[PDB]
Amino acid sequence: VQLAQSGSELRKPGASVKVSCDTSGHSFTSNAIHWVRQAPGQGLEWMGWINTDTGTPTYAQGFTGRFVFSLDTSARTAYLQISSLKADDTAVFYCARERDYSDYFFDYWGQGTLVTVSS
Amino acid sequence: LCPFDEVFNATRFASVYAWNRKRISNCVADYSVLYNLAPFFTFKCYGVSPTKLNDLCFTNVYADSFVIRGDEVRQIAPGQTGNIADYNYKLPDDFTGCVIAWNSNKLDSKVSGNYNYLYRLFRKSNLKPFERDISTEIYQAGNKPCNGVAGFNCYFPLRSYSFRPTYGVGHQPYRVVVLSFEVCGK
Amino acid sequence: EVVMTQSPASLSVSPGERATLSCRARASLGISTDLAWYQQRPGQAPRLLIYGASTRATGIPARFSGSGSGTEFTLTISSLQSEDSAVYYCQQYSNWPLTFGGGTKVEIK
Ligand SMILES: *[C@@H]1O[C@H](CO)[C@@H](O[C@@H]2O[C@H](CO)[C@@H](O)[C@H](O)[C@H]2NC(C)=O)[C@H](O)[C@H]1NC(C)=O
Fold it and tell me: Based on the domain organization, do B58 and B100 belong to the same domain?
């Protein structure tokens, strides 16, 4: 219920950021691990998901092109790639994993990784 | 506008033997959102040309959605025979509409096997067009009555698809949406 | 996409008083009880309160009772405590623009 992600990270505009999400703390009967973005003041925004053991990523309407989902060789930890960071891309990126298969609500949530775009 | 994205993008698709039927009435139907999507691997239309859908008005539009494997996608057509056509979903010989199917291996397949999708294997007689049979009575394949007890020559009519990612293209799950025409395009 | 209009945008109700949170979705055909209620206390990550329209997640107290079906959904919290002052989001797992709600800031008088 407390999937371990990576820590907060400061990246200059135009750089790239690596966000991890360790999932091996529990046993999951699901093939999907979802990514949720929360702005520093606004609400939750669903980014997409990546298919575990298949590696096929899916993105939302506004989170495509610069956002890349990737998995591990062991298909446990899921990585998040943001390239060409803008000054408005600072946010907290939550890693959500559903408990049962095809139950698309997120019982298990990550601690949250806050990327900051400044100088 | 018409709620096509409530139909094609829905998370839950029903098994083929219990296919859903969604009413689409009193709306503007823009069918150009269907053509220009990369994953739709079968946009087949019967009696209407696909490029002329935006110029036609229909009194009702019914969207039947279900999940089958790739090998029986060809079975969803007027005048077709087999397990899906005869026992699960029959299209009339004078069917006027479009059949849309796309591979959903990332959504409906599980490495340990997705048993959630069922199809009807045994039935006394072939289904009439657009007829739905959700009965799960024990099929009597022989002479001795089953009395609701499965066993020898007493088969449960429903079977499980067992979708897995490692299966071949023909064995992967396919999400099928059938549009029935008989709602003005713009 | 299915867009939620979660209202009121901010509540302020006394402890021990029912707080009704509503989440309407702009879905033509409806959701049919495919709604999930989350709770994000300041700081910590969101916690799944109610999956589906009515049934609650494991470990959730009986106060968090859910309701609604199709388009109009309502979450009620009975006998609020100081630890229920959080932000509540609603999600549809019906289509695949999975969308969260705008959120409701619940405040204790
Ligand atoms: C189902 O949802 C997908 C998004 O996951 C829609 O795909 C988008 O469609 C719009 C046009 O309507 C395009 O501008 C986007 O680029 C598409 N995004 C992706 C990721 O494909 C799709 O249109 C929806 N289905 C229907 C019938 O509207």
Answer: yes
Write the DSSP string, B130-169.
T------PPEE-SSS--TT--BTTEE-SEEE--B-TTS-G
What CATH number corresponds to the domain at position C59? 2.60.40.10
B31 Cβ inside 6 Å of ligand 1: no
State which approach was used to obtain the coordinates: cryo-EM
Whether B3 and chain C come into contact, CB under 8 Å, resolves to yes
Ligand 1 touching residue B107 (CB < 6 A) = no
Are residues B55 and B88 part of one domain?
yes
Give the whole-angstrom CA distance, residue C63 versus residue C80. 8
- Of the residues C6, C31, C51, the best mutation for testing chain A's interface (the one with the most A CB atoms within 10 Å of its CB) is C51
Cβ separation of A101 and B111 shorter than 8 Å? no
CA of A67 to the centre of ligand 1 (A): 17
In a shared domain, residues B133 and B55: no
Expressed as residue numbers, the domain containing C45 is 3-108
Sort B74 into a burial class: Cβ within 10 Å, 0-12 / 13-18 / 19+: middle
Any alpha helices (H) in chain B, and if so which ranges? 5-8, 32-35, 105-108
- Indicate if ligand 1 lies below 6 Å from the C-beta of B33: yes
Q: Does ligand 1 lie within 6 Å of residue B9's CB atom? A: yes
The total number of structural domains that make up chain C: 1
| One-letter identity of residue A44 | L
To what resolution in angstroms was this structure determined? 3.3
- With b for 16 or more beta-carbon neighbours within 10 A and e for fewer, the C65-79 pattern comes to bbebeeeebebebee
Q: Which one of C1, C29, C95, C96 would you pick to mutate in the ligand 1 pocket, going by the greatest count of ligand atoms within 8 A of its CB?
A: C96
Could you tell me how many helices (H) and strands (E) chain A has, helices first?
0, 12
Q: Cα(B185)–Cα(B27) distance, rounded to whole angstroms?
A: 9
Domains and CATH numbers, chain A: 2-117 (2.60.40.10)
- Nearest atom in ligand 1 to the alpha carbon of residue B9 is 1
Range of the domain at B82: 1-112+165-186
